[PDB]
Amino acid sequence: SVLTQPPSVSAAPGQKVTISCSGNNSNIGKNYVSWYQQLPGRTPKVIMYENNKRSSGIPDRFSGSKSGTSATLGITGLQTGDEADYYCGVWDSSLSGGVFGGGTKVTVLGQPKAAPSVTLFPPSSEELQANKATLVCLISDFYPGAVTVAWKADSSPVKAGVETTTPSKQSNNKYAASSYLSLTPEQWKSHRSYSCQVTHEGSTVEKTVAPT
Amino acid sequence: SVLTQPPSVSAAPGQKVTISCSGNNSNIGKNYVSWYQQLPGRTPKVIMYENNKRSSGIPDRFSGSKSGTSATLGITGLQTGDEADYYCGVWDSSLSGGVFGGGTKVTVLGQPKAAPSVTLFPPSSEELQANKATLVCLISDFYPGAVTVAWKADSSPVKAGVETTTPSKQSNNKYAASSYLSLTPEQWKSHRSYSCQVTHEGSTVEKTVAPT
């Protein structure tokens, strides 16, 4: 870290966020400054180049500026999707090489709770032809990332055969997982219906499937 | 991803892994390369710089080198604490900014490798009756826990609305994930088929679905 960047910025949804980048005359003062976004677990991507030029597909929210030996990144209308680390980059002329800042964690404070979207899928045609039956309860767009999944065959709770993936942080910093129930085609065709009940922050969402 | 890295690399504890990072004369060829370690949950840290310089507290087991347009990070005496995601970074003298590799997942093999079980689910009847269409690619029973998923609309790759969850260990100790694709029921019916392609350890499998 040749460039000096604050360790973090926090703001409520819709608010304005500024990120400073402090350097000398050999780097920021002489050369083009670029900005990089890094979503957790993801590699850094360029979002701004040539001090204020926005990279392809980069939203209007994002704004970039250079003045003197200091660069700034402006995010107006902060969204939950902008929660990432931001780095500023410039070529150092003093020591002929590319330099970077320490980074800045951007937090959306007081984030609104998002109920999960729930899509239940019966065993596919191709699957049953292979004497295999799998039900998928796709659980998407929820926040925070914790869920309880319960299954039922008609009225009775299904204990075994259930697997629920650990909620993973999606593109929009919101979450997704999927619960799956592997049955024998004998077990599936026997019952009248199947249920997947998803509990998120105390509230339940239940969807139902039936054969054909 | 401008620089190219293999997505997954593994070996038994005590063995050796190498991670290739391929670029051009303008990036890897001219400038100094760094390597990043992104530990599970934690913030990425630089472990290698100036092609072969190790950071503080980085053991002898980690070695970096660069020949031509490609850099390699080697790891010997592979141990569980090395399991992380690693990426390369270099300045691109033509683009006048930093370029990064897509990342590599390093796995210390603790059980037999397992090829994924792939189940493609078309949009359900209840869903299409609501003018919504969701394709779900259930990927389970695989080890190591890293997949690359590609979607095709007939044969042309789908470049939008694809979400892939992070693999999580299940009750069988093997990993599971799911890739989902959102389409308008017109997008589902305008194509002959949709396909989900799962890449795991250089082995690739294709699943296909068609309307009814």
Numbering used by the authors:
A (entry chain B), B (entry chain A): 2 to 213
Question: Could you pull the original sentences from the published paper?
Answer:
In H6 and M8 dimers all six CDRs (three for each LC monomer) are traceable in the electron density; in H9 and H10 five out of six are traceable, in H7 three, and in H3 and M7 only two CRDs are traceable. In some cases (H6, H9, H10) CDR3 (residues 89–97) participates in the interface; both CDR3s in the H7 dimer lack electron density, while in M7 and M8 CDR3 residues are located far from the VL–VL interface. In the structures of all H LCs and in M7, the association interface is roughly symmetric, and is located on the five-stranded beta sheet (strands 1, 3, 4, 7, 8), where the 3, 4, 7, 8 strands establish the intermolecular contacts. Interestingly, most LCs show a one-step unfolding process, but three H LCs (H3, H6, H7) and one M LC (M9) display a two-step process, observed both in Far- and Near-UV temperature ramps. Analysis of the data shows that the kinetics of proteolysis correlate well with amyloid propensity: H3, H6, H7, H9, and H16 are almost or totally proteolysed after 60 minutes, and more than 50% of H10, H15 and H18 LCs is cleaved after three hours. Inspection of the SDS-PAGE gels shows that the proteolysis pattern is different in different H LCs, suggesting that the sequence of proteolytic events, and not only their kinetics, may be characteristic of each H LC. It is also remarkable that fold stability and kinetics of proteolysis do not necessarily correlate: M7 displays the lowest Tmapp among the M LCs, but also very slow proteolysis kinetics; H3, H6 and H9 show relatively high Tmapp, within the H group, but are almost instantly proteolysed by trypsin. Firstly, and somewhat unexpectedly, the most temperature- and trypsin-sensitive LCs (H3, H6, H7, H9) could be successfully crystallized.
The crystal structures were all refined to satisfactory refinement parameters; in all cases the LCs were dimeric, with an overall quaternary arrangement closely matching that of the previously reported LC dimers. VL and CL domains display very different structural properties in the seven crystal structures. CL domains (res 115–214) are typically characterized by high quality electron density, are all very well superposable, and the dimeric CL–CL arrangement is clearly conserved in all the analysed structures (root mean square deviations -r.m.s.d.- generally fall below 1.0 Å over the entire CL–CL dimer - Table S3A and Fig. 4B-bottom).
